[PDB]
Design a protein. Sequence first.
Length: 371
Amino acid sequence: EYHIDEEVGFALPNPQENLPDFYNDWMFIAKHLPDLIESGQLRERVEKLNMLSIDHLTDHKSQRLARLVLGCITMAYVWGKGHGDVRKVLPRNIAVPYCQLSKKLELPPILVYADCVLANWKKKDPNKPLTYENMDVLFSFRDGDCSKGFFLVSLLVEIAAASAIKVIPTVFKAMQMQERDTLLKALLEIASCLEKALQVFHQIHDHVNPKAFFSVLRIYLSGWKGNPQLSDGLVYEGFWEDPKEFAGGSAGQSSVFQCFDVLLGIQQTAGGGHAAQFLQDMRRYMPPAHRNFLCSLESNPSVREFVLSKGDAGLREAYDACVKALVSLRSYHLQIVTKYILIPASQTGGTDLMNFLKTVRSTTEKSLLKE
Ligand code: HEM
Ligand SMILES: NS(=O)(=O)NCCNc1nonc1/C(=N/O)Nc1ccc(F)c(Br)c1
């Protein structure tokens, strides 16, 4: 019911690679975005389409692949070549089906993390394991944007977190059964798997270039909420009356970090600050099943209060290890932002952005029991 895989966690277990033949006009545009943008034929070829209906998309993986295809097409149409020439209105041939599809999956009509990472992958050899060399994305925007490296490294962090996520039922089951040793073991295991996820994060340096990321890829993943280039928003023609605002694709849209914040009693979304508000808004951009999972974790008894009541140095230490793993992940993530956003931007927007991430990191570090 929560749609969480044992192996790949929040990611889609094995994404559908082909659409039905009825939507071959969509798939051809999405498969050839690098050429169609560079040549300048994308906007024209989207302009002259047919309003294809949603009813032939039968199952969930088909509907998700359609969201990814239509999402990638919508980014490249709006942002064009990505040198400031923008379209303020999305044609009703593409906008109506995309909006009707998006209402069915309870997601906004914009490319989200669930599309371009969680559903945008495949294994080359099905009989080999989930490593970077054996994997590839389904869609990219331009040549030399490093879509593969960025989406797959994000995906591999989701996969690393799946080892911790599958232990969560043991944590709550151990608390109700009043089983101290099982709980201690489950927390050390979660801490161990979140420590492993940090090493997976290191691969970002191997497969993504700062200048390629900042110049090319960042422009296509940006949205139309609080954006000067579309201050009113994007007009979805033939569906909504006025231009609607929707935030761009981010890995703040991931459920991984929020999952373990809620599990460990770290009250990020508590208070009325910008950090709390941002993280609560990012839930709207997650699949409904994953929102329901985060709701379910909030509804359960507090792991934090359970551990604090027992006067047990082993349980406190194990709970701290989980918290420390999250702090370390966010601490490393700040370094990435310095390398991949701050330095390229230089060669108070940068200051506020780092203070956001540091507020979230500080809220995490405040939850430690020893310090
Ligand atoms: C080049 C790589 C990366 C850059 C430049 C980057 C940049 C950022 C920025 C600027 C934010 C602030 C929110 C926003 O304005 O959208 C953010 C938030 C976030 N990023 Fe990344 N990021 C990168 C890679 C990753 C990866 C691989 C993950 C893996 C899951 C990740 C997870 C997050 C999360 C969870 C947040 C939400 C804030 C939090 O919970 O601490 N990011 N990122
Ligand atoms: N204008 S801004 O400050 O750069 N805001 C956007 C920042 N976030 C990002 N920009 O570019 N990738 C980002 C990001 N950060 O965690 N994660 C991310 C990871 C995988 C994806 F498929 C997508 Br889509 C986003």
